[PDB]
Each structure stands twice: as C-alpha cells, then as structure tokens.
Design a binder for these strands. Structure first.
Ligand SMILES: [Zn+2]
Ligand SMILES: [Zn+2]
Ligand SMILES: [Zn+2]
Ligand SMILES: [Zn+2]
Ligand SMILES: [Zn+2]
Ligand SMILES: [Zn+2]
Ligand SMILES: [Zn+2]
Ligand SMILES: [Zn+2]
Ligand SMILES: [Zn+2]
Ligand SMILES: [Zn+2]
Ligand SMILES: [Zn+2]
Ligand SMILES: [Zn+2]
Lengths: 162, 162, 162
RNA sequence: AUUCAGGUGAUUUGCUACCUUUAAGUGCAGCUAGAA
RNA sequence: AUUCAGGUGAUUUGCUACCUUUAAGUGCAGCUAGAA
RNA sequence: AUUCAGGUGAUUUGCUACCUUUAAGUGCAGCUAGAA
C-alpha cells in the first residue's frame, strides 16, 4: 500500500453527497492530508483511507474496532503513530488521486515518520484490507452508523466529471 | 467441557466390574466428587474423567504423562489446581450423569475455584481430548496398566438398568 | 543425518573431473575430513557435504546464502561451530563412504564438538536438505558458479570402479 | 583447501524472516517522537 | 482413594516439545569453545 | 475535522486474541490459593 493525496475538486464533489467525507484542505494543515493506498478493492471500487494524527479519544478505540486501524512503530507500541480512519475511507478515481513523491521529499521529521508508518502498514496490509472489507459489509448491511456513506458514495462518485 | 456428578448407584455398578472406578461418596468429601464433561467421545462412548485435589505425588507426574491432565490457573503455574484423572475416566449414561448447577451455586471459594479450573480446561479442550484418546488406545492395546478397564467397562456399562 | 569419511581413491577420482571436489587428505589435518550424511537425495543421487572449521570470511556469509550452512551450538550463537560447505557437496557411492565410529571415539574435545554440531544439524535437517536442493537446481540451471560440478560429477561418479 | 550466489521494503544499519517450484521484506535491535 | 505408561536424540542431567492417525528428540537451561 | 460497531467464555473488569464467509473466548493483567 502507499501514500496518496486527492484533488480538492473531487473531495468537494463527494462532499455534496456526504459531509462525512474527509476534509482535504485546512489552514492548520502543515502538509496536505494523506490517504492510504487501496485499503479495499471490491466490485471494481478502489478505496483510499484518510490518515489522522493522534487525538485524545484514540485511547478508547480498541484494536478490534472496525472504525480505525491504529498505527505505531514496528515493535515499539508506545510510539503511537496516529491511525487510519476506515470509517471515512472513500472510493476514488485514479485520475484525481496522486501518489506522494516520497522519492523527492527532503529528509524531514515528517518524511521520516511516513516511513515508520509505511512499514507498519506494509506488514499489516491484510489486517487492514480485512478490516475495510468487513467495515463496508456491515455499513452496507445497515449494522453500522456514523461512517461514510459507502453505498451512496459508490453510486455517485464516477459521475464526477459531469 | 463441563462439570458433572454421577449417581451413586451407577458408580457402585461399575465398581462391580472394576474397583479402579473412582469413589463417588466419602465422609471426608466436602462437596460431591465432580467429573469433567466428555473428555472423549468415540464408538458412541461418552467419557467423563474424575477431578482430584492436590496430592504429594502430583509433583512427579510430568506434563507428557497420559495418566493425568494437570490443572492450574491460566498463566499462573504456581497456582496448582489439582488434576484430571484420565487413568480413571469412565463411560457414562446420560441418564445417570448430572451437570453441576453452576448458575445457582452460592459465591464461595469452591465455586470460585471451579471457574478458574473451567477456563483452563476450556482453553485446553484439545490436549485433554487428545490425551484421553491416546490413553484409551494404549490401554486397549495392552500397553498400559493400572488404569480403569476401558474394554470391560465399555462392554458392561449399558447393562446398568438390569 | 550423520558423520562420514570418504575413501581417498574415490576423492582423487572425482578430482579428475572437478578440482573443486574437497581435499580428502592434508598434512595439517588432525582428524580426517568429515562429511555430513545425505544432505540431498534426488534422482537416486546421495550427496554428502564437507564440514569445515572457521575461517575469517565466514563472517561475511549470510544465513540466506546457499553456499554454506553455518553451524553453531544450539541456542548459543556466539559459539560458532564452522559450517557445512554445500557449494562442494558431492555424490557418493555407499561403498566408498564410511560412517564415523562415534560409539568408539575416546572422549576428547573433538568428539565433544561433533555432538554439539550433530544436534544442531539434527534440529535443522530440513533447512539443510532444503538448501542443498535449491543450490543444485540453481547450479544446474546455470544461475550459480564456483560450486562443484553437480551435473558433471553426477554423470561420471558411478564409473568409479573402472 | 576452493577466500560474501542473486533477489523481496517508495526507506532498510546489524542480525534475523522470506524468494529463486520466478517469486519473496517478517521479526528483534538501532535510529527516530515527526502529525494529517 | 487408586502411590511417575513407553518411547523418538550414533551423545542428552532437569524440564519441556513430540509420537503411541506408525510414529516421534524441539526449545530452555546445564555442560561444552573443541576444528575439517 | 468528523468524538468506543456488535458478538464469541455455565463466570469475565482492563487490555488483548478471535468472529462478523454464521462464525469466534485466546493471551497478559488484575482478582484469587478455594479441594474431589
Ligand atoms: Zn467491539
Ligand atoms: Zn500493536
Ligand atoms: Zn485390585
Ligand atoms: Zn513418559
Ligand atoms: Zn501450564
Ligand atoms: Zn545473498
Ligand atoms: Zn543460527
Ligand atoms: Zn522419554
Ligand atoms: Zn535430559
Ligand atoms: Zn473521528
Ligand atoms: Zn465484544
Ligand atoms: Zn470485559
């Protein structure tokens, strides 16, 4: 899996249909909001999930939860690295999605953390995909609330360019 | 698996054929003798094994032994909890066997220990069933002595009601 | 697996076809050169690999390498015990191969080390056989150089007695 | 005797794990404490 | 209540693993630093 | 940004494991040392 950004246009568009769709731009955002790379591929839908830095309430989110996949350094649990917000993953269009230029990022604390994250994500691909799959099923079945509207998003998203 | 008692009649009856069959009633017995719940099911035989509180010689009984399955609190080895005496498991008749009313036992040290035991037994079902299976095979094969007479008990036990 | 020696004749013979074939006798050799016992059995070929005591360059040989299987005491990694030189394993003829008389070796530092080695080898039989298998395939495929000439050795070796 | 097989990580120092049936990057150290 | 089943290690003290679906000696200690 | 999905244990607080393909209760804490 990999790190992506998403065009602001395309994020506004999904926001017409679901305010739950993650904010793309914010004055207080140092770097751009980043997404994780095809957490879920099903019925020809490619999903990307939002990354998000630590909040207070992440302490209550237990590992079993389908809402989030908690990140942290490999083998170093006390090094919390934020989480993947699956509850807000969205379907994407290859053309409005862009991979982070990791090969060109200046060596900074951030790019550094991205690699810590990346590796933990790489070694947990499956748990992630597995979680995303189930989250959607449930969401769709009407057994889970307060997530992104998968059903509706999946319906409207490709009508972006019109 | 679960906790059972066995009618005294039926225990006397098997004792006609094998004195090795565990004692059901004793003046020094606080609670009734308790048995563990289908350690072995084979050729339509349901086996229950006797529970037994610590004796001195349980220290010499090594884990590999087929005679006994040593109990102790989950993850707390120094908390020895007696053992399951497979060498004396017997085949039973659903109608002379009775489940302990755990849902109605007053909160006492005993009921408390039963749950410690139960869980350790639950998480080791397989080893237990596995041990019981092998113990019988061997016993039947004539490669093990000083156990209950499985072959003979299996033959005679259903003729209980006559 | 076990410890063997190989007749000097048969070792000279293979040396007619491949100088890479391990030296059998040397003035500086305390004990005879020893071989490990059927590292590989395939298309009716029985392979024995040479043992060899620590050299400087064994530090660069990584575990993944097909060239050698590094020995050392069980659970005691700092106790390097030389390595098995698979890159030089050779096919053998039961009649020119001989098992070391371990049962009759006087208790010496050497015989002592042999058992340390033996056990580590016994507990890794598979990795060894697995490595040998792959090493040959590759060697045969022409993807590996500087080893014994398996293809050529396999062809010529049985013509020993002529 | 025969003096480091080639690969798997958007990164990879040490070891280890895995792939070479054409496929494969885990784990324990170290380093880091980044922020959406 | 009923006082430790045998075995698998060219060697193996304790425990463990494992085998007794015809099979099975792993791991931790302990001892060992040996040489091709 | 967006502030804990429900389950699997004759019992189970905290975490965790597992299940969510109709399935699934593990492990570490803590509590506890009961007796056949
Ligand atoms: Zn939950
Ligand atoms: Zn974790
Ligand atoms: Zn008698
Ligand atoms: Zn035994
Ligand atoms: Zn235990
Ligand atoms: Zn290499
Ligand atoms: Zn090693
Ligand atoms: Zn034994
Ligand atoms: Zn021993
Ligand atoms: Zn949130
Ligand atoms: Zn739950
Ligand atoms: Zn709870």
């Amino acid at each position: 899996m990999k790190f992506y950004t998403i065009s602001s246009k395309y994020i506004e568009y999904l926001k017409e249909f679901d305010d739950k769709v993650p904010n793309s731009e914010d004055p207080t955002y140092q770097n751009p909001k980043a997404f994780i790379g095809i957490v879920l591929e099903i019925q020809g839908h490619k999903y990307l999930a939002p990354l998000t830095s630590p909040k207070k309430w992440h302490n209550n989110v237990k590992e079993s939860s389908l809402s989030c996949f908690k990140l942290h350094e490999n083998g170093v649990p006390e090094n919390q690295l934020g989480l993947i917000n699956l509850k807000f993953m969205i379907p994407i269009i290859e053309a409005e999605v862009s991979l982070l230029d990791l090969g060109n990022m200046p060596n900074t604390p951030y790019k550094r953390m991205l690699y810590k994250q990346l590796q933990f994500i790489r070694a947990n691909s499956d748990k992630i995909a597995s979680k995303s799959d189930t989250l959607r099923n449930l969401v769709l079945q009407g057994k889970m609330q307060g997530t992104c509207n998968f059903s509706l998003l999946e319906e409207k998203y490709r009508d972006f360019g019109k």
